[PDB]
Design an enzyme around this catalytic site. Structure first.
Site, PDB file in Angstrom:
ATOM      1  N   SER A   1      39.691  26.836  36.663  1.00  0.00           N
ATOM      2  CA  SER A   1      38.517  27.288  36.229  1.00  0.00           C
ATOM      3  C   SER A   1      38.154  28.649  36.711  1.00  0.00           C
ATOM      4  CB  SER A   1      37.349  26.400  36.884  1.00  0.00           C
ATOM      5  OG  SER A   1      37.273  25.044  36.779  1.00  0.00           O
TER       6      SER A   1
ATOM      7  N   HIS B   1      24.218  19.488  37.225  1.00  0.00           N
ATOM      8  CA  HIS B   1      23.961  20.703  37.459  1.00  0.00           C
ATOM      9  C   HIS B   1      22.657  20.959  38.220  1.00  0.00           C
ATOM     10  CE1 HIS B   1      24.350  24.954  38.625  1.00  0.00           C
ATOM     11  NE2 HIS B   1      22.968  25.220  38.102  1.00  0.00           N
TER      12      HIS B   1
ATOM     13  N   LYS C   1      39.339  24.401  31.717  1.00  0.00           N
ATOM     14  CA  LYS C   1      38.223  24.135  32.452  1.00  0.00           C
ATOM     15  C   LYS C   1      37.633  22.717  32.260  1.00  0.00           C
ATOM     16  CE  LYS C   1      34.291  24.357  34.600  1.00  0.00           C
ATOM     17  NZ  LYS C   1      33.181  23.182  34.604  1.00  0.00           N
TER      18      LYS C   1
ATOM     19  N   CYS D   1      35.574  15.926  39.536  1.00  0.00           N
ATOM     20  CA  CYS D   1      34.574  15.006  39.992  1.00  0.00           C
ATOM     21  C   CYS D   1      35.368  13.755  40.455  1.00  0.00           C
ATOM     22  CB  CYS D   1      33.633  14.832  38.596  1.00  0.00           C
ATOM     23  SG  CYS D   1      32.423  15.963  38.432  1.00  0.00           S
TER      24      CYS D   1
ATOM     25  N   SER E   1      25.064  31.662  46.132  1.00  0.00           N
ATOM     26  CA  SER E   1      25.178  30.353  45.607  1.00  0.00           C
ATOM     27  C   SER E   1      24.251  29.854  44.618  1.00  0.00           C
ATOM     28  CB  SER E   1      25.313  29.508  46.529  1.00  0.00           C
ATOM     29  OG  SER E   1      26.340  29.587  47.666  1.00  0.00           O
TER      30      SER E   1
ATOM     31  N   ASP F   1      26.814  30.358  37.193  1.00  0.00           N
ATOM     32  CA  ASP F   1      27.034  28.797  37.178  1.00  0.00           C
ATOM     33  C   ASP F   1      25.620  28.188  37.081  1.00  0.00           C
ATOM     34  OD1 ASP F   1      27.881  26.429  37.552  1.00  0.00           O
ATOM     35  OD2 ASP F   1      29.341  26.670  39.204  1.00  0.00           O
TER      36      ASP F   1
ATOM     37  N   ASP G   1      38.558  20.457  35.410  1.00  0.00           N
ATOM     38  CA  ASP G   1      37.470  20.651  36.696  1.00  0.00           C
ATOM     39  C   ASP G   1      36.277  19.580  36.327  1.00  0.00           C
ATOM     40  OD1 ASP G   1      34.567  20.963  37.104  1.00  0.00           O
ATOM     41  OD2 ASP G   1      35.163  23.391  37.691  1.00  0.00           O
ATOM     42  N   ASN G   2      35.654  19.391  35.148  1.00  0.00           N
ATOM     43  CA  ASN G   2      34.643  18.370  34.964  1.00  0.00           C
ATOM     44  C   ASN G   2      35.124  16.909  35.169  1.00  0.00           C
ATOM     45  OD1 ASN G   2      34.157  20.814  33.692  1.00  0.00           O
ATOM     46  ND2 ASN G   2      32.431  20.001  32.568  1.00  0.00           N
TER      47      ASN G   2
ATOM     48  N   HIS H   1      28.080  28.503  43.531  1.00  0.00           N
ATOM     49  CA  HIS H   1      28.430  27.843  44.872  1.00  0.00           C
ATOM     50  C   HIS H   1      29.346  28.520  45.524  1.00  0.00           C
ATOM     51  CE1 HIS H   1      26.679  24.522  42.217  1.00  0.00           C
ATOM     52  NE2 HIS H   1      27.615  24.693  41.572  1.00  0.00           N
TER      53      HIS H   1
ATOM     54  N   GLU I   1      30.193  29.297  33.877  1.00  0.00           N
ATOM     55  CA  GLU I   1      31.020  28.340  34.301  1.00  0.00           C
ATOM     56  C   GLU I   1      30.675  26.937  34.048  1.00  0.00           C
ATOM     57  OE1 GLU I   1      33.940  26.932  37.383  1.00  0.00           O
ATOM     58  OE2 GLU I   1      33.508  28.810  36.457  1.00  0.00           O
TER      59      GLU I   1
ATOM     60  N   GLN J   1      37.822  32.323  34.784  1.00  0.00           N
ATOM     61  CA  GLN J   1      36.631  33.267  35.016  1.00  0.00           C
ATOM     62  C   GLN J   1      36.994  34.969  35.036  1.00  0.00           C
ATOM     63  OE1 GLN J   1      33.648  33.440  35.474  1.00  0.00           O
ATOM     64  NE2 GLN J   1      32.961  31.422  35.261  1.00  0.00           N
TER      65      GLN J   1
ATOM     66  N   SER K   1      24.834  24.057  48.252  1.00  0.00           N
ATOM     67  CA  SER K   1      26.335  23.974  48.062  1.00  0.00           C
ATOM     68  C   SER K   1      27.250  25.076  48.983  1.00  0.00           C
ATOM     69  CB  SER K   1      26.597  24.084  46.765  1.00  0.00           C
ATOM     70  OG  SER K   1      25.979  25.575  46.208  1.00  0.00           O
TER      71      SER K   1
ATOM     72  N   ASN L   1      33.229  27.233  30.603  1.00  0.00           N
ATOM     73  CA  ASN L   1      33.093  25.816  30.664  1.00  0.00           C
ATOM     74  C   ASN L   1      33.983  25.099  29.451  1.00  0.00           C
ATOM     75  OD1 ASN L   1      32.046  23.382  31.810  1.00  0.00           O
ATOM     76  ND2 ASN L   1      31.500  23.033  29.694  1.00  0.00           N
TER      77      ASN L   1
ATOM     78  N   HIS M   1      34.838  20.240  44.408  1.00  0.00           N
ATOM     79  CA  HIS M   1      36.225  19.850  43.736  1.00  0.00           C
ATOM     80  C   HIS M   1      37.173  20.836  44.722  1.00  0.00           C
ATOM     81  CE1 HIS M   1      34.168  18.778  40.512  1.00  0.00           C
ATOM     82  NE2 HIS M   1      34.317  19.692  39.282  1.00  0.00           N
TER      83      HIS M   1
HETATM   84  N1  LIG Z   1      28.806  18.638  40.097  1.00  0.00           N
HETATM   85  C1  LIG Z   1      29.990  19.253  39.527  1.00  0.00           C
HETATM   86  O1  LIG Z   1      30.818  20.001  40.158  1.00  0.00           O
HETATM   87  C2  LIG Z   1      30.087  19.460  38.096  1.00  0.00           C
HETATM   88  C3  LIG Z   1      31.255  19.799  37.315  1.00  0.00           C
HETATM   89  C4  LIG Z   1      31.230  19.874  36.018  1.00  0.00           C
HETATM   90  C5  LIG Z   1      29.825  19.795  35.398  1.00  0.00           C
HETATM   91  N2  LIG Z   1      28.788  19.490  36.072  1.00  0.00           N
HETATM   92  C6  LIG Z   1      27.417  19.286  35.367  1.00  0.00           C
HETATM   93  O2  LIG Z   1      27.488  18.194  34.858  1.00  0.00           O
HETATM   94  C7  LIG Z   1      26.703  17.975  33.902  1.00  0.00           C
HETATM   95  C8  LIG Z   1      27.489  17.216  32.731  1.00  0.00           C
HETATM   96  O3  LIG Z   1      28.592  17.964  32.394  1.00  0.00           O
HETATM   97  P1  LIG Z   1      29.558  17.443  31.095  1.00  0.00           P
HETATM   98  O4  LIG Z   1      30.468  18.240  30.810  1.00  0.00           O
HETATM   99  O5  LIG Z   1      29.839  16.047  31.520  1.00  0.00           O
HETATM  100  O6  LIG Z   1      28.543  17.356  29.817  1.00  0.00           O
HETATM  101  P2  LIG Z   1      28.701  16.448  28.574  1.00  0.00           P
HETATM  102  O7  LIG Z   1      27.805  16.647  27.665  1.00  0.00           O
HETATM  103  O8  LIG Z   1      30.192  16.295  28.482  1.00  0.00           O
HETATM  104  O9  LIG Z   1      28.377  14.832  29.308  1.00  0.00           O
HETATM  105  C9  LIG Z   1      26.924  14.709  29.296  1.00  0.00           C
HETATM  106  C10 LIG Z   1      26.664  13.234  28.839  1.00  0.00           C
HETATM  107  O10 LIG Z   1      25.624  12.694  28.953  1.00  0.00           O
HETATM  108  C11 LIG Z   1      25.089  11.900  27.851  1.00  0.00           C
HETATM  109  N3  LIG Z   1      23.565  11.799  28.001  1.00  0.00           N
HETATM  110  C12 LIG Z   1      22.714  12.999  27.600  1.00  0.00           C
HETATM  111  N4  LIG Z   1      21.460  12.416  27.901  1.00  0.00           N
HETATM  112  C13 LIG Z   1      21.545  11.148  28.389  1.00  0.00           C
HETATM  113  C14 LIG Z   1      20.585  10.101  28.850  1.00  0.00           C
HETATM  114  N5  LIG Z   1      19.163  10.281  28.915  1.00  0.00           N
HETATM  115  N6  LIG Z   1      21.135   8.752  28.965  1.00  0.00           N
HETATM  116  C15 LIG Z   1      22.406   8.598  29.096  1.00  0.00           C
HETATM  117  N7  LIG Z   1      23.413   9.707  28.593  1.00  0.00           N
HETATM  118  C16 LIG Z   1      22.993  10.717  28.372  1.00  0.00           C
HETATM  119  C17 LIG Z   1      25.546  12.627  26.693  1.00  0.00           C
HETATM  120  O11 LIG Z   1      25.652  11.957  25.348  1.00  0.00           O
HETATM  121  C18 LIG Z   1      26.627  13.464  26.902  1.00  0.00           C
HETATM  122  O12 LIG Z   1      28.015  12.327  26.790  1.00  0.00           O
HETATM  123  C19 LIG Z   1      26.194  19.283  33.486  1.00  0.00           C
HETATM  124  O13 LIG Z   1      24.746  19.473  34.035  1.00  0.00           O
HETATM  125  C20 LIG Z   1      27.117  20.268  34.148  1.00  0.00           C
HETATM  126  O14 LIG Z   1      26.622  21.417  34.435  1.00  0.00           O
HETATM  127  C21 LIG Z   1      28.910  19.485  37.131  1.00  0.00           C
END
Ligand SMILES: NC(=O)c1ccc[n+]([C@@H]2O[C@H](COP(=O)([O-])OP(=O)(O)OC[C@H]3O[C@@H](n4cnc5c(N)ncnc54)[C@H](O)[C@@H]3O)[C@@H](O)[C@H]2O)c1
Ligand SMILES: NC(=O)c1ccc[n+]([C@@H]2O[C@H](COP(=O)([O-])OP(=O)(O)OC[C@H]3O[C@@H](n4cnc5c(N)ncnc54)[C@H](O)[C@@H]3O)[C@@H](O)[C@H]2O)c1
Lengths: 486, 491, 486, 486
Positions: free
Chosen positions: B421, B359, B244, B253, B79, B140, B248-249, B56, B214, B425, B84, B239, B413
């Protein structure tokens, strides 16, 4: 085409936003459903001076459906949502004088035009509104100052000198708002020197939306100079304890997220003033990890802040270490240029109070050798030439939730605006001297709350006869005594 | 004429000054990146490295690129999401000639894959400007890594029978189902590249020294490749650095979810029943932010540990079917797919909001919603659409067409967490570059470096760190300078 | 008959609490129901050194229903709940050597007795336990120091001089715990110098409950001195992420409420150490309005504190301003007598870490001219002679949640104790010079969580095959890779 | 005139806690410093009916230092702290009739003795108090019912039969409190039929501490039956917005941690009533991870609860699923025997409102075939014979923070009690017919806040002249208008 707006072609986005907004504005939806046919405000000419947002457009729609004719302007140069304004014009719901990014001069011309009505008999004669919806007291101010100007005009049969000078009583420079308002008053004295006094006869009242507007009303009242009835909508419980607090909790964050690029978490953010608005601000900021530092003049509010885990300090003791500053006092000169000179590099400054003078914006912009760059449309970075350090001001110090975002969401505004519609109806039916500022009954205040319970799936418990008699209330309310603070 | 300006494909170069100004403001908090530039801009540890990024392109990312650039690398970027990109951020990099960019806000899926492929295509001025690949990849979500690997598979098939493999020329998958648009557009690029040069992808492998990933979703893709013995190059998992994933996560968020929601959903969050599907690192943050503004959060989870954690924070944990009719807003945060189906959507109350912060867009069945027989759709505002079912006349409101809402409907973010993060990198990129001198695996940065990342940001926030005495250090069995926790510590 | 407790008549009050506590301790209820017929621990001799609370009684009952023979003592002189110890003795569930307010001498005598078993074939001879449940490592320490002492005893055919002296190394007075332990070791060498080494063949392992105990195990492993297998129970996710954090969030407050009469809201409360325990302490303190200030050595943990809105400082910069100090580091010499002398009048000092040397209690009590007055049981005010200022110590620096209160509630202890039973069963089932420390599998960790879902009405979602394949997990888990931090 | 307490040897423990408490009670410390020489209350006979805690002892000491003669009793059978009562008797600053775990008969006998004074001239002749410090209104009630009794006695020359009857009007069984009060009144009619009316002459007023007592005062006023001046202390800002909210936030949790062994985190906890008390209860419960569900009759309060993220339901829709129930309504029959029969196994029930009749304890105790076991001091498990299900009640439904714990901490009580002293001085000064209920001035209310700022290191901001005039307040306050809700 009498209205003066940005762009009529934005009407459909506005109309669509109004419908989505309306889903949660159950108070306004119900007043329309209940009174659209009986039209209790029929024949009433209503002038409004209140931030023209989507939410406000639903308020205006509501008043229109209850039979009123409406003219409207915004109470801030940056708060108008141009799509909202275009929706009202296309639908012929109101005659509007408002656009986003007005000059101060145009602000006062729009207010004056909104106060100008053409008599239903002949278009030759001018008249005023029957009712006023005001937010901040500007419409109420131009009316009283208009009358004072006319009385001074007749007294010596010439334009009062205080309207033809850049200086106040003490030789100092007048504010831009006063100079622009005085320019409008002089113009009106020459077109018609009985304009303002002539309106008093048909004026049945003003309903004031906010704390700053109420303070202005109370000052006129205590001086015996209020010239029309007034209803204080700000102090309804369903307004002050919801809009001011919960509304800002969300809308402050929205304004900050749109204007300030930085992370709030872990930052020392100073909230100046811990009243109804300040309490909401601090709650939202803590919710996203900020360490909130509060300033207060009131020892009770200070203690309340302390009970929520916040440090209470005087600005001087933290101005050099804090990262973000938010004024919520409704006072003036809370953040001075001198305070600003001591702030750390890229510290952010924002105001959520009604008027921009909480921050010394004038002193900042006229500081010798200061450089300014537009960060984004309404965000400006000012760099002092001596230290080379910069401060970042959000929307020139105007209320940040409406200047850098879209203000409070529909739910709380429906609660505030349901009080407005009820205040207008009350003033109209009472239509017919020492004028008073009154509040709405607790019965109506509870009613406003009842109208919004279904939005949130809230299930209310009902008292038994025995319980009701024991706590000394009617089963149908009101449930608290007049002095209850909630 | 400028090669960077001419070769780049962005929306508007005139937005550059706004980008440059934002970058300077962001640097106040991006102390990790500021320090790396200060420490290494003279010795240029990345000198000669050709870096391709698929992440992004935001203001925060522009500072990352500037950091790689100050360290000696040549760079090209795109990106990893069609919505994004922040056009002023992209313009800033092109105007200063920091990088050749292929990115704009609101790309089509076709354009997305053409930009990635172009970001992966380099020319060598010392070999008559002939085609080559990057030395290092910043990824990413794993799309840069995907096209590479699918590119190698494609070439291996092509070579067997000296012709384009038929799985590339067909609009259907192995099961006769209609392929996703991303696969169709990627295969279209792969077919075109097989015709330009069928040894392009395998040719890059010689000079590729690694990829640094990432996010959680891109890491999952890497681990799947590694366990199948199909990872073709070294990888660093960024990640899972503590600085990170735990920042970040979660905290990123907490703020950026709200910003996305505030921009797309006009309604008040306070009092609303908001479902957060997934209570991992991202979900934990989403929940904290949502309840910070008065919402009543309901969690769905498949992991009983995470479910119990949600319950300890006061949240109701339910199965979606049991609350799909009563809830007001739904946020997917799982990284899984088919978490909110068309069938769930048909049961939602009138004007329910649906958004995703994971993602990929497939957490919500957007394709099935857009292609539902007789569905009606109107664009409310930018990237906000209301869909109406013809049989019930009920509507649901989708934010950002299911794309990660914090980056698609808002600015992502803020600088502080992104610097953490992105410092990981740069460190990862340097590690892969100095290393250039079964088969391939995924690794993480050491705890020493992980703690270093955090040290670089303490002064931003006026944090004062206590120092162990020799007596204390010996007692808890750690060095005074760290690391302070064993490898399995969870923070 | 052989048990030494305060009063067996309290038994009924303990048995009632156990049943009530079992409402929420579903993990232990399930293990009892599932394994009481087969009795997997049948014939096992288990010695426990773990705070004998009501929750611990249910753990001991579970080990018993599963076929084990049991001997128990507390791992702290103030943490035993007399009614809980009575319940175990009354029903002949285990032999108990524990009571609240033991002397340090009796603490070590109780432990040593808990380790002393009689040979079932020939009861005229002594043997040791087959398994050990430990919290803090004292049972593991006496075993290893006993073996070291026996070996040293043989090389010179006399008591080693380190067991008879009381300074050691710097000439600093040795801690009472070491002197009392050494007194017991000396006494046992003279009675039988093969006691400790004789237990090694039949010892199948120890399952360690807490961070401090695990740290002691890791040190022994790195030096190659670990004499039996060990399972680290503290680092199960369902222990460290629940007990350490959520358990403390409630039990710290309960401990502070019993010992400190003052209001927490508005006070500057310093939490030293922001680990699993510190995080929980902070959350609880913030919940009742306190302004938490954190100290840390780890920059990652310090940044986490900042992200939650907490100021992070070094003790010397707030020691004079803060009102309350809570140590949670698992370290020593965190609050020194020098720090205590700079504290404000009636400042409260408490510890939640496993050992009492986080605060320099010995130094405070033995300060020249110090005056001490007991405010209530386990609460003492110390007054310095020069300044005449006072500080108030809760529990003589012993873990305040167990010393001044009843410790963590049933729900989280069941999760922790479900891990213990599973660990005990693993070590028993598995019955070589080098021994190591391992943890339970993630399958069992997730299982602990599954067993408690119905308590709180949690409904878990189930993956479809296509989703399980997409996220690369089995439908029944484990759902996370081994390095996942939750 | 000789005190009746549990044990005078506990005196030093009370005197020790008093001094520690004083550290935060800077309001009372200041009043003592300023007025101990001049003694504005000299000669005044003050009878108090208010929970005799350590905090209350500092109030009584303050009253004594200001020159008053004092006799006291608790306003609840379980809230007395025996060491606090002892300290007063030992220091000989008040005659006390109070102890923990009184019978209902003893309670009324103790209150009646507290109202009895030996005439300043004669030792044989009896008289009443000059002032009353009341909490709940029982002192005020016995006086008014005493007067009614005497008037009714002379009307028909006989003991009124309502005093002798065990049932009342509707055929329902009189509360034990009423039967015991009536028995005392009947006896006083025989000893002296002008006792109560004789007191009215010398009574200058009552100052009422709490919401329930105030309600009783307002009912008597509206009916024109109030017989002495009254000051509503509850509704000072520094009482209602601090004591009722932030006091309960800590003390509810203290009461629950002492009486309820279970973990609050994750539990569905129902808070009935979301007024000033309920607001604090909810915040404290959420703070330890509970999922709070609110019941309300007031739509405004219900909306407020929804704005904080709490589900708002009727008891019937959650009575079977909720884990813990807390009544905070000040109403009666909020939790009936029928509701209790539907609750899940080992559900907990507590009340934090002033009276025990919020929960139908009487009905539960007298339910046919009800089994009851004492789980611990003031905690009882009741099992229904038809279903064999149990519910657990904390301190027999009496206010849980004072029954199962030590009430609110010193800081908030000082704010409440600084108001009491100020009110007593106000009533005493005005002595130099329809009686009304008044509140203290905002000047004094703010003054109470100022007295406590230094405790928390609060730095107040001072207004400039220009700012003072702009917001129309004096630089020294008051800073808010009378109807301001804070
Ligand atoms: N938007 C952003 O800026 C941003 C930032 C960080 C991560 N992410 C993305 O967010 C997503 C989650 O990342 P994360 O680090 O929280 O992963 P994570 O593994 O820590 O959390 C995901 C959770 O979802 C649960 N889960 C899976 N399938 C499910 C279902 N069908 N019903 C209910 N719960 C379910 C799992 O048990 C897990 O606890 C990823 O796709 C990651 O790439 C996005
Ligand atoms: N009271 C209880 O019921 C209970 C429950 C669980 C654990 N514990 C005990 O609490 C203690 C801490 O446990 P934990 O699980 O949180 O360990 P942890 O390692 O998670 O946390 C300890 C933290 O203290 C910090 N620290 C170390 N020395 C320091 C110093 N001098 N100043 C400031 N910070 C310092 C470390 O950086 C670390 O983050 C241990 O002794 C453990 O046995 C007690």
């Amino acid at each position: 085409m009498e209205s003066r707006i940005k762009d009529i072609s934005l009407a459909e986005f506005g109309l669509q936003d109004m419908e989505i907004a309306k889903t949660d504005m159950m108070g306004l939806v119900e007043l329309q459903r209940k009174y659209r046919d009986s039209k209790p405000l029929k024949g009433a000419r209503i002038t409004g001076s209140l931030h023209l947002t989507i939410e406000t457009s639903v308020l205006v729609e509501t008043l229109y459906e209850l039979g009123a004719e409406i003219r409207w302007c915004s109470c801030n140069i940056y708060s108008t949502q141009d799509h909202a304004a275009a929706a009202l014009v296309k639908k012929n719901i109101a005659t509007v004088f408002a656009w986003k990014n007005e000059t101060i001069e145009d602000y006062w011309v729009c207010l004056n035009d909104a106060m100008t009505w053409r008599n239903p008999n002949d278009k030759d004669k001018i008249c005023g509104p029957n009712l006023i919806v005001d937010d901040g007291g500007d419409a109420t101010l131009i009316l009283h100052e208009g009358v004072k100007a006319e009385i001074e005009y007749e007294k010596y049969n010439k334009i009062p000198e205080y309207l033809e000078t850049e200086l106040d009583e003490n030789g100092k420079q007048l504010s831009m708002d006063l100079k622009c308002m005085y320019k409008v008053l002089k113009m009106e004295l020459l077109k018609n020197p009985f304009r303002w006094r002539g309106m008093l006869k048909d004026l049945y009242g003003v309903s004031e939306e906010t704390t700053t507007g109420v303070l202005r009303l109370k000052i006129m009242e205590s001086e015996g100079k209020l010239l029309l009835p007034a209803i204080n909508v700000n102090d309804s419980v369903t307004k002050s304890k919801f809009d001011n607090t919960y509304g800002c909790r969300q809308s402050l964050l929205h304004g900050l997220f749109n204007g300030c690029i930085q992370m709030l978490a872990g930052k020392k953010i100073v909230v100046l003033g811990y009243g109804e608005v300040g309490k909401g601000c601090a709650q939202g900021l803590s919710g996203v990890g900020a360490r909130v530092i509060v300033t207060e003049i009131d020892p009770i509010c200070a203690l309340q802040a302390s009970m929520e885990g916040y440090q209470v300090s005087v600005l001087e003791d933290v101005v050099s270490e804090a990262d973000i500053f938010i004024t919520a006092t409704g006072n003036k000169d809370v953040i001075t240029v001198e305070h600003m000179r001591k702030m750390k590099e890229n510290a952010y400054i924002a105001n959520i109070g009604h008027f921009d003078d909480e921050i010394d914006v004038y002193g900042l912009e006229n500081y010798p050798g200061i450089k300014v760059i537009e960060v984004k449309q309404n965000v400006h970075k000012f760099t002092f030439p001596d230290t080379q350090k910069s401060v970042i001001l959000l929307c020139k110090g105007r209320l940040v939730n409406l200047g850098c975002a879209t203000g409070h969401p529909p739910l709380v505004m429906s609660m505030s605006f349901t009080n407005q519609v009820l205040a207008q109806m009350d003033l109209w039916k009472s239509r017919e001297t020492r004028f008073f500022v009154k509040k709405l009954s607790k019965e109506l205040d509870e009613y406003v709350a009842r109208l919004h319970l279904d939005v949130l799936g809230i299930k209310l418990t009902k008292l038994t006869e025995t319980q009701a008699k024991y706590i000394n209330v009617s089963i149908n309310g009101p449930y608290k005594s007049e002095d209850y603070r909630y």
